[PDB]
Amino acid sequence: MDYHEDDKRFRREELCREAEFLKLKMPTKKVYHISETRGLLKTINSVLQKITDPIQPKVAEHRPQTTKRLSYPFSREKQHLFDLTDRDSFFDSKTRSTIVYEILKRTTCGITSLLANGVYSAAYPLHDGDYEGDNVEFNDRKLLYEEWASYGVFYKYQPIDLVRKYFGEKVGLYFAWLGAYTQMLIPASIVGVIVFLYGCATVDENIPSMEMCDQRYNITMCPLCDKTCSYWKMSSACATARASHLFDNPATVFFSVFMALWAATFMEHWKRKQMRLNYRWDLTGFEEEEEAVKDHPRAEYEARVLEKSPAYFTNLVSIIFMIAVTFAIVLGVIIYRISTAAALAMNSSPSVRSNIRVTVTATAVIINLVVIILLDEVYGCIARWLTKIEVPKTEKSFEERLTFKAFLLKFVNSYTPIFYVAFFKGRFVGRPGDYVYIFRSFRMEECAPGGCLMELCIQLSIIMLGKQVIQNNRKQRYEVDFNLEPFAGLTPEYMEMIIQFGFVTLFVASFPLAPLFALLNNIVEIRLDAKKFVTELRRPVAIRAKDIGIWYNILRGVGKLAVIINAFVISFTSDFIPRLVYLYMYSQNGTMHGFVNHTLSSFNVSDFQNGTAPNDPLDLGYEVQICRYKDYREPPWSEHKYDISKDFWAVLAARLAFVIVFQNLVMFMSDFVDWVIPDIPKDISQQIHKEKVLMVELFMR
Amino acid sequence: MDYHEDDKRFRREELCREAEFLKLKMPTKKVYHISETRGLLKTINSVLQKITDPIQPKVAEHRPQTTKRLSYPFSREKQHLFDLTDRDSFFDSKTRSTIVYEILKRTTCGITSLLANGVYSAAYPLHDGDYEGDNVEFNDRKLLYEEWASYGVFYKYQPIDLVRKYFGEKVGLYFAWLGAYTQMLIPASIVGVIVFLYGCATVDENIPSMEMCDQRYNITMCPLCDKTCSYWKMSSACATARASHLFDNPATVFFSVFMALWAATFMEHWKRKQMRLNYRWDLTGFEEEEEAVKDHPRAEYEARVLEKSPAYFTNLVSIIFMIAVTFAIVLGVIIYRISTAAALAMNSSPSVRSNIRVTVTATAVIINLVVIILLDEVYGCIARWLTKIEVPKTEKSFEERLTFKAFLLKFVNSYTPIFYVAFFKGRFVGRPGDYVYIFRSFRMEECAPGGCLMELCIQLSIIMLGKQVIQNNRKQRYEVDFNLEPFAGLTPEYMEMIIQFGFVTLFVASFPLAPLFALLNNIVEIRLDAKKFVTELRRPVAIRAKDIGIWYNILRGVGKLAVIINAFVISFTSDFIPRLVYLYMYSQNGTMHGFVNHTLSSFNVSDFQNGTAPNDPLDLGYEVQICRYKDYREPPWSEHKYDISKDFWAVLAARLAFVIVFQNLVMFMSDFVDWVIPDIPKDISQQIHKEKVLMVELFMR
Ligand SMILES: [Ca+2]
Ligand SMILES: [Ca+2]
Ligand SMILES: [Ca+2]
Ligand SMILES: [Ca+2]
C-alpha cells in the first residue's frame, strides 16, 4: 500500500549507459521541487513522484485552475482562481496529477520526448484505492463502480460531477455528450416505433402490396441476371413488398423531416448543455495560445531550415491524402462487389436452396462488415503515418489533423457500400434490349427483386448491430496499475459514436427504427465505457478541455449532409415520388390502382442481345413472350420502342423538384430551430451575472 | 466664439410651469459635477455643459475607454485602460462628448425621457471650429473637408483614423465597410466589363441570334395580347435578341459563380478587416450586459404587471408584422401590375408610335420606382409603430427589431417587381388554345417579345440608377449648429447599401455590369456621405461599437439567398439550359442550328377561344393559318395536340438538376472559401500576443 502520491513513471533497469544517464539527468532537475522514492519488485525498478505542499500554489497560480470559495449564495458555493484554506487535502487527485504532469511536461531533459525516445516505458497516475475491495473506505472508484459502472444501474442517471471529479473534464464531457445523445434518442425511438407500427398496421391494406401479391394476374418479369437464372414471378418476391411498405410510407417522409429537426434540436441542446457544464466546472479561458511546447521533430525541422537558409509540402501531403481517400472509396466499392459474389458462391456451394436471397445477403453484409473492421485499423495507421510525416507545430494541431484524416477514412469505408446500394446500384444498367458490360464481359448486377430498399435496410441493420455484436459477443498499487491496459484516448471512442450518429441522421429516410437500435446500443455502451474506464484501463491524466472540439464541427457537417442525403434517398431509392406522380397525374380515379402495371414496362423476348436469354425458358411451365422490367420506357408495340418515354422524364422532374423543395425547406427549418433556441440559457446568464457582481462586491471591500 | 466645452442642450424659454420645473430640477443634480452657462440670443435661451477636469477620470474609469500609452514598440504606441499624463488636452472631443452623454443618460430627472417628454428640443455636441473658414487653425473638420469630404479627392484613400477620431467608431465602421465594399467592387466590375465585352464580341456570330434576325424564313408569332394587337414577326423583335445574348451567355453563368465566390471572399475580408480595426481602435469588451437603462414605457409596463398580479403579445405583434409583410408583397405585385398599364395608357394617349416597347417599359419602371420611394417612408413608419407598441426592454433590442422590420419591408417592396418579372411573369399563362383569365375577364400578360430577360435587366438598370438619380439630380457656434440638420442615424444609410448589395449578389445572373454601376454609384456616394457628415448634419454623439451588428447577419442571409436565386435565374428565366439541352440531346450535328425552330411550337389559328383572335388578321399582308408560341407543346398535327410533350419535361428536369448542382456546388465552394480564409489574421494575432506579453512584462516590475 503506497502512500498518498501522484503520477509515476516506469524505468528500464536490469547504448544502455546513455539511456541510464538520460534517465538520471532529469531527476537531478527534479531534486529542487519533486520528492522521489525508488522500488524494486523482481528485476525492474520504478520511481515515485510525490510533490510537496508549498509547490501546489506555485504551479496552481502560473497555470490558472479554479478553486471553490467558502461563501454559498443560494446554497451553491462560488469559485475563484485560488483560495488558501487549511487542511490542504482539498486539492483532489485529478488536480494533483494535472499539476505533476505539467511539471513533467515543462521540465526538459518534455516527458513525451523521453517517452518516444525509449528510456521511459510509461508514465501513469495511480487509481485511488481499488474497486470492489474488501473493507474499503469511501472510495470514489468504488462509488463509481457501484453507482455508475454497473449494468444494474443503467436506468439511473449518471453522476457526471463524480466522473468529472475522477477522470477529469474531457472524459466528463465525453460521458455528458453520450448521455445527452442517449436521452435525445428516446423521443426519436418512440416516434420510430410509432412509424413502424403505422407501417405494420397499413401494409395489409396497402394497394400496391395487394396488387403485387395478388395471384391470377400472371406477370412474368425479366431474368435480372445472366444466362444462369431465369424469369421469376413478381408475386414470388412480393413478401419483400410486405417488408417494403414498412420503410417507404409517408410516415417515413414525415420521420425524415422530424429527424432533421431532431438533429438540429440535439445540436443546440448539447450547445446549451456544454455551456451549462462550463458554468458548473470552469469558465476561465486563461489557458492562452502558444503556451504548449513545440514538437521535437518540428524543432529539428525548423533548425534545419534555419541552417540551410512548408506550405508546398503540406499541400502535397493533403493531395496524397485526397488520392488516398479516393482509393479508399473505390476499394470499398470493389470490396462490396467481390463480397456479394463470395457470399453467393459460398451459399451456392452446398445447395442450401433458401430461395429467399436474404440469408445470402446477410452473409454478404456480415463478411463485408468483417473486411471493414479489418481495414479500419489499416486506415487508422495510414492516417497516423500521413499526419506524422507532415510534422505539425503543436500537439493539438497534430491530434486535430489525425482526427480529421481518420474520420474521413472511417466515413468512406463505413458508408461506401451503403451509398453504393442506395444510389449507384441498379440505375446505370440499361434496358433488356442491350445491357451495359463492365470490363466488356461482366454485366452490372441489378439489386434485389421487388425492391432493394429491403437490401439497403438489412445492410443498415447488420452494420449497425455489428458494433453491438463485437462488444457483447501483498501486492502494492503500482504493479496492479502496471498490469492494467494503458489509456489510449477518447478519439476512437468518439469515432464509433460519430459513425452511429451518421447512421441515425443519414439513413432514417429508409430505416425508421434506427434510433431504437441506436438507443439500445447506447444504453449498454455507456455502462461498458464506464466499466472500461473504472476497472480495466489506467487512470487518464485529466487534460483540461472547454468543449468537445472538432467533433462538434463533424456533427454539424454530418447534419448538413444528412439533409441532401435524406432528400436523395426519399426521391430516388424510396419509390415514394412515383407513387405521388401516379396518384396525381395518371390515376384517372383518385386512387392508387394500377400503379404496378404503370411502373412496369414490357419487353419482347425476341430482342435479347447475343444469347443473354436463359437456357431454360420453360421453368414457369409456359413459353413467355414478353417480360416486364422497371425502367419507365416505351412498350415494344410502339414506333419508338425501348426508348425513354414521357413518364420517365415526368417522374425524374418530380424527383428533382422534391429534392429542391425538401433540401430548401428543411435547411430553412433547421436554421429556424437554430435561431429560436438561444445558445446561452437565460438562467445560466443570470447566474453568471449574479456571480460576477457578487465577486465584484466582495472584492470592493 | 464659445470656449472649449461639450454637448449642449436646447431649452424652450419664452403646463409651462411644470415643464420649467422639470427643466430646472436636473441642473440642480448637475451642480456637483457639471459647470453650466446660459445664453440668450433673441427669444429662446440655451445652456452649456462644460465638464471639469476631475470628473474625466471619475467617468473614464467606471466606463472603461481606451487611452494610449507612452512607449512605442516597433513605432506603434500601445493601449491601456487609463493613463495619467499632464497637459490634459489629450482627451479629444469625441471622448469628452461621450463622457458627457453618459453623464446625461445616467442622471435621472435619462436624457431621452426628458427629450421625448417635450421639455428639451435637442441635445447635441458642437463641431470643432468651422470647415472652409478663413484663417482657421489646423481644424479636424477642415482637414476632413479638404482631404476626405471632397469630390476632387475621390481617387485617394480615406483617412479612416481621422473619421474615427472625429465622428466616433460607429461612423468610422460604416465608412470602413463602405470603403471595403467599394474596393471589392473593382475586380467584380472589371470582370463584368470583360464579360459584357465577350457578349458584345460574340453576338455578331451567335447562331440563335442570326437564326432569329434572318429574313426569308417568314415565321409568324402568336398575338401575345388580347384582340387589341395582332400577329408580329419574330425578326421585328430580334434586335432584343441582340441585346439578349449580352446577358445569358455562358460567361454570365461563370460570372454568377464568380460573384458567389466574390460575395464569400468579401464577407471574409470584411470579417478580417473589422478585427484589424478592432485591434487598431479598441479590443476591450468590458462593456458588459444589462448596463443600459431600461425604457420608461417598459418600466411603466412592468410596474403595471406587478401591480395587477408578454410572450403572447410579442407573438401577436410578430404575427401582425407577418401579415403586414404579405400585404406588402401583394401590394408590390399589384402596384407593378397597375403601373405597367398606366404607362401603356400614357404612351398610347398621344400616339408616339415608338414601336419598340422599351420607352413604355422605362416609363413603367420609372413610375414604379417613384411609387416605391413613396411607400418606403410609409413602410418605415409602419415598422416603427409596430416596434414601439411591442415596447422592448432596452434601446439596443428596440433598434435591432426596428432594423429587422424595416429591412424586411424594404426587401419586399424593393424586390417584389423584380421577382415578379424574373419568375412569375409569363409562365402561368396557358396555351393559345385556352388562356388563364384572372378575375374571369382579364388575361395574364405575357412578357416582352423576344425574351423578357431584356425587361428584367432594364428594370434592374433603372432601379439601380434611380438611387443615383435622386441624390445627383458675429454669430456664435451653438446657433450655427442649431441651424444644421440633426443627425438621424446610420440605419437609413445602411439600408440603401444593403439593397445595393442585394442587387449585386441576387441579380448578376442576368446583369453582368451591375457591379460596374454599383462601383460608379459608391464612388460618389462615399463623398456625398462625407460632405453630409462634415458640412450639413450635426455632430454624432460617437456611440461606441465593436462590429456592424445586425447588418452582418443580413449580408450573410442575402449572400445565402443569392445562391438559390441565381440558380433559379440561370435555369428558368435565362434560356441557357434549353440551349444546352438542344446542343446535347437534339442537335443531331453538334451545333446550335435549328434551336429557334425547336423551341417554338405551332398552333392552328382555327382554335382560339371565343373571339380572342385579332380583328385584323391581314396586317402582315397574308392570311396566316399557324402561329408559333413558346411553351414546348405538341404540334396541332398530332394525336394528342396542344399537350405537354417530352421536350418540356426533359428541359424542366435539366433545369431542376442544374438548380441542384449549382446550389450544392456553390454552397460547398462558399463554405470552402470561408474555411480556407482565417477569421483572425495571423499578423494581428502575433501583434496582440506581443502586446499582451509586453504589458505582462511591464506590469511584472
Ligand atoms: Ca465505447
Ligand atoms: Ca442558436
Ligand atoms: Ca448615403
Ligand atoms: Ca473563416
- The figure for the number of domains of chain A is 2
Number of helices of chain A: 22
Question: Could you say which overall geometry of chain A the principal axes of the C-alpha atoms support?
Answer: elongated
Kindly name the structural category of chain A.
mainly alpha
Proportion of residues in β-strands of chain A: under 5%
What oligomerization state is this entry in? homodimer
Q: How helix-rich are the residues of chain A, as a percent range?
A: 55-70%
Main sheet: strands, sense, barrel of chain A: 2 strands, antiparallel
- Rg of chain A, please? 31 Å
Bound compounds, each kind once, are: calcium ion
PDB class: membrane protein
Keywords: calcium-activated chloride channel, anoctamin-1, membrane protein
Assembly: dimeric
Entry title: Structure of calcium-bound mTMEM16A(ac)-L647V/I733V chloride channel at 3.29 A resolution
Molecular structure report:
2 copies of one chain form a homodimer. With 701 residues, chain A is mainly alpha-helical. Chain A contains 22 helices and 10 strands. Chain A has helices at 16-30, 56-62, 93-106, 111-117, 140-147, 160-200, 207-213, 238-244, 250-281, 296-307, 311-348, 359-390, 395-422, 453-472, 477-483, 491-506, 514-536, 550-573, 577-585, 595-599, 646-676, 682-700, and strands at 8-10, 37-40, 45-48, 67-68, 79-80, 122-124, 437-438, 442-443, 601-604, 626-629. In chain A, the strands form 5 sheets. A two-stranded antiparallel ribbon of chain A has the order 1-6. In chain A, strand 2 (37-40) and strand 3 form a beta hairpin. In chain A, helix 11 (311-348) packs parallel to helix 13 (395-422), helix 14 (453-472) runs parallel beside helix 17 and helix 16 (491-506) runs parallel beside helix 18 (550-573). The longest helix of chain A has 41 residues, at 160-200. The first copy, chain A, starts with 7 loop residues before the first strand and ends with a helix. Chains A and B meet through helix 21 and helix 22 of A and helix 21 and helix 22 of B. One calcium ion is lined by residues 268, 674, 677-679 of chain A. Chains A, B: Homodimer. Interacts with CFTR. Interacts with TRPV4. Chains A, B: Ca(2+) 3 binds at residues 268, 674, 679. Chains A, B: Residues 198-249, 337-364, 425-453, 571-657 are extracellular.
